[PDB]
Design an enzyme around this catalytic site. Structure first.
Site, mmCIF file in Angstrom:
data_model
loop_
_atom_site.group_PDB
_atom_site.id
_atom_site.type_symbol
_atom_site.label_atom_id
_atom_site.label_comp_id
_atom_site.label_asym_id
_atom_site.label_seq_id
_atom_site.Cartn_x
_atom_site.Cartn_y
_atom_site.Cartn_z
ATOM 1 C CB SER A 74 -8.825 -0.574 0.723
ATOM 2 O OG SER A 74 -9.746 0.397 0.563
ATOM 3 C CG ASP B 73 -2.352 0.579 0.659
ATOM 4 O OD1 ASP B 73 -3.138 1.161 1.526
ATOM 5 O OD2 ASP B 73 -2.680 0.523 -0.570
ATOM 6 C CG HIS C 99 -4.885 3.538 0.911
ATOM 7 N ND1 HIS C 99 -4.965 2.188 0.611
ATOM 8 C CD2 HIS C 99 -6.056 3.880 0.434
ATOM 9 C CE1 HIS C 99 -6.127 1.804 -0.078
ATOM 10 N NE2 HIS C 99 -6.862 2.915 -0.113
ATOM 11 C CG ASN D 295 -13.719 2.917 -6.292
ATOM 12 O OD1 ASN D 295 -12.535 2.713 -6.480
ATOM 13 N ND2 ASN D 295 -14.440 3.350 -7.258
#
Length: 275
Positions: free
Chosen positions: A221, A32, A64, A155
């Site tokens: 996520s 990430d 993130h 998303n």
């Protein structure tokens, strides 16, 4: 303090945390934007950046991943929140520049590090709109040499028939999760497709961020780090069970929610399909 995020709490994680099962023995690939070393309630086994811009990658600018990895395993003591496997060895991979994206060459690369670096668990917070044969060789090979990968997506929501699932997504190998809240209900911004394979939480989960404190992320996520938590931790009672095995383990034994298109197969349940 001592507080724990209900994040897992919903999958029967806190449970195994008793017997002694604290995801020990496993290394987890959290690929990430990065994870904080700084953080009082974090412990990083290592890492290695693959894209030349922010090239430690133990400084994360974004969150993130410091956050994702958070749900992965966050130090247990008088510091806050906890996850599935608080005492696994965090491997922190940065294939993104953070506060932006990056290239499959950065996605594909650190995810061969964590697989050809003996990483047990892989957490891929990201989804791509198309994927190649190059992305299909490392996902096929990271899965053909012991590794079990889980990736985000959600998303893009619904499209009627056409499915909205990222890459690693629409392929067989890999297990892509999605986000649930607690009502045990879907989430608006949550990806669907013949591929959804299982479902976890993912909505307004507290964790830790750059600076010294936490904050709130809602997304899909942050769900992936639920699986690959139990994942480390399903490899707890059988340091010797394969990928394949544990695949059916979580998947074999979830709770019904809806059709094999937004629902998958149910929710995570630690101490059920993980025995």
């Amino acid at each position: 303090a001592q507080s724990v995020p209900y994040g897992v709490s919903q999958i029967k994680a806190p449970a195994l945390h008793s017997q002694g099962y604290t995801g020990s023995n496993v290394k987890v690939a959290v690929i990430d934007s990065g994870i904080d070393s700084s953080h009082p309630d974090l412990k990083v086994a290592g890492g290695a950046s693959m894209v030349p811009s922010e090239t430690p990658n133990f400084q994360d600018d974004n969150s993130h991943g410091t956050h994702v990895a958070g749900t992965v395993a966050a130090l247990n003591n008088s510091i806050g929140v906890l996850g599935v496997a608080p005492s696994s060895a965090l491997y922190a991979v940065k294939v993104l520049g953070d506060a932006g994206s990056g290239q499959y060459s950065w996605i594909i690369n650190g995810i061969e590090w964590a697989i050809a670096n003996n990483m047990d668990v892989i957490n891929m917070s990201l989804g791509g709109p198309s994927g190649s044969a190059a992305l299909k060789a490392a996902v096929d090979k990271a899965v053909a040499s012991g590794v079990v990968v889980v990736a985000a997506a959600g998303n893009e929501g619904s499209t009627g028939s056409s499915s909205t699932v990222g890459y690693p997504g629409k392929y067989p190998s890999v297990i892509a999760v999605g986000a649930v809240d607690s009502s045990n209900q879907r989430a608006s911004f949550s990806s669907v497709g013949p591929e959804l394979d299982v479902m976890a939480p993912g909505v307004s989960i507290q964790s830790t961020l750059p600076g010294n404190k936490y904050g709130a992320y809602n997304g899909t996520s942050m769900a992936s780090p639920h699986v690959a938590g139990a994942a480390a931790l399903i490899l707890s009672k059988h340091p010797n069970w394969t990928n394949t095995q544990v695949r059916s383990s979580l998947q074999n034994t979830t709770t019904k929610l809806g059709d094999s298109f937004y629902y998958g197969k149910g929710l995570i349940n630690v101490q059920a399909a993980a025995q």
